[PDB]
Structure 1
Amino acid sequence: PIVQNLQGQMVHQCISPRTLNAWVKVVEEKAFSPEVIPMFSALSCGATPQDLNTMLNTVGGHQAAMQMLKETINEEAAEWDRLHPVHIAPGQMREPRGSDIAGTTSTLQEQIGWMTHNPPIPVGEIYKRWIILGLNKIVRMYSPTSILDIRQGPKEPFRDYVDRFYKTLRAEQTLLVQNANPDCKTILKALGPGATLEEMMTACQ
């Protein structure tokens, strides 16, 4: 990644073994549960495009997902090239294409040059946006259940039902009451409109 040194200047640092392992392990343990995306974003803080590719390429499984991600990246790269056409001057900085932002046709030195320019051309952040767009699509695709099929069991505590409900809603990206069991539904109907989630959960506790 690119970080500020103790002095203050923006310099390249090697991606750490801790970071590399953390990403690999969270994908192994969580697959594409929605919470993997904010973890990816945090683990890739200050990442160059090279670093972002390292993280994606170190994933051993889920190659259907990784291929879908490449499709999304290529679509975003194509849209970049449509909006930002490029025409080199000796010793000068060239303008980045989509494939340069994605790190496939740009060197680490070019990437550092763009990211540490004044003003910065934030190719790491632009690429991370494309990757997260693609990851969101994967999360949605691999979401196993419709919110319509999250219904409270006869003996299921309301809290556990609400956990399943909002877990599903997050993956899928009034109904809470409708999908509740008969006893809690009657209680929730009697609360009236404008009841908070806290008040509903207290009522059915």
Structure 2
Amino acid sequence: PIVQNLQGQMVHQCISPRTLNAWVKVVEEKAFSPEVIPMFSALSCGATPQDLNTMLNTVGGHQAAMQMLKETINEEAAEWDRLHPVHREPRGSDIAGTTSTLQEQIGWMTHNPPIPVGEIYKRWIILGLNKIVRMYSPTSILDIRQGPKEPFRDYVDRFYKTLRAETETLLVQNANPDCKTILKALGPGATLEEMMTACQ
């Protein structure tokens, strides 16, 4: 990421081994489950475009997903080039880090006024990662139906987990006959707290 030294000039702080390993391990364990994205964002805090690429390059498997991410980056970079025509001023390929030095990236971010190439590129990466989360989502919301002997609590967990990866009235629909009858009896506009308390 980014620091000001004792000499006054702003220079690249080396990305830490804890952070490097943290990001590698989350992707190993959680793949591209929704919670990986908030974590990516947090671990890549204050990151230069170089650092962002470092973090993505440390991911070992999942090359289909990472290739999809490349395409989303290439798309968002072209969209930037369209809205910001060269008349230095950072183009899309400079923001993604393909055609810009580290000192330039430090330049734009630490410049006054700040051109936050790191936060912009992260926005594109996250945008791409979300697309990956949505595709790799295994089950559809429609197929989450409460089992006969399944607790409501466990069904609601499965419902809103599936919902996050990919509505309040559907939760009632896909409940089992016994809970469904109790849920309809509470009437319209009932809170999840009340619904869960009822089927306990």
Q: TM-score, normalised by structure 1?
A: 0.93
Q: Match of 1:27?
A: 27
Select the residue among 119, 126, 141 that pairs with 1:125.
119
> What's the CA shift for 1:10?
5.2
Within a 5 Å distance, the mapping from 1:69-88 to structure 2 comes to 69-87=69-87
Q: In 1, are the aligned partners of 2:10 and 2:106 still within 8 Å (CA)?
A: no
Unaligned runs of 5+ in 2: none
Q: Distance in 2 between matches of 1:9 and 1:136?
A: 36
- C-alpha separation in 1, matches of 2:194 and 2:7: 52
1:202 and 1:6, CA in 2 relative to 1: closer, same or farther beyond 3 A? farther
Cα deviation digits, residues 38-66 of structure 1 (max 9, x gap): 00000000000000000000000000000
Please give the TM-score of this superposition, normalised by the length of structure 2: 0.95
Which piece of structure 1 moves more, 165-174 or 28-37? 165-174
Runs of 5+ unmatched residues, structure 1: 88-93
Structure-2 separation of matches of 1:34 and 1:103: 26
2:181 counterpart (181, 186, 192): 186
* Conserved? CA contact 2:95–2:118, under 8 Å: yes
Structure 2: how far apart are the matches of 1:2 and 1:192? 55
Percent identity over paired residues: 99
Distance 1:179 1:118, change over 3 A: same
Report if the CA contact (8 A) 1:146-1:168 is conserved: yes
Q: How much has 1:12 moved relative to structure 2?
A: 2.5
Q: Which moved more, 1:35-44 or 1:172-181?
A: 172-181
The 1:203/1:85 distance shift into structure 2, 3 A limit, reads same
Instruction: Return closer, same or farther for 1:191/1:7 CA change in 2, 3 Å cut-off.
Output: farther
1:3–1:46 contact (8 Å) kept in structure 2: no
Once residues 130 and 10 of structure 2 are traced to their aligned partners in structure 1, the CA distance between those partners, rounded to angstroms, is: 31
| CA offset digits 1:2-52 (Å, max 9, x no partner) | 146799985431100000000000000000100000000000000000000
Q: Aligned residue pairs: how many? A: 199
Cα gap change, 1:5 to 1:187, in 2 (>3 Å): farther
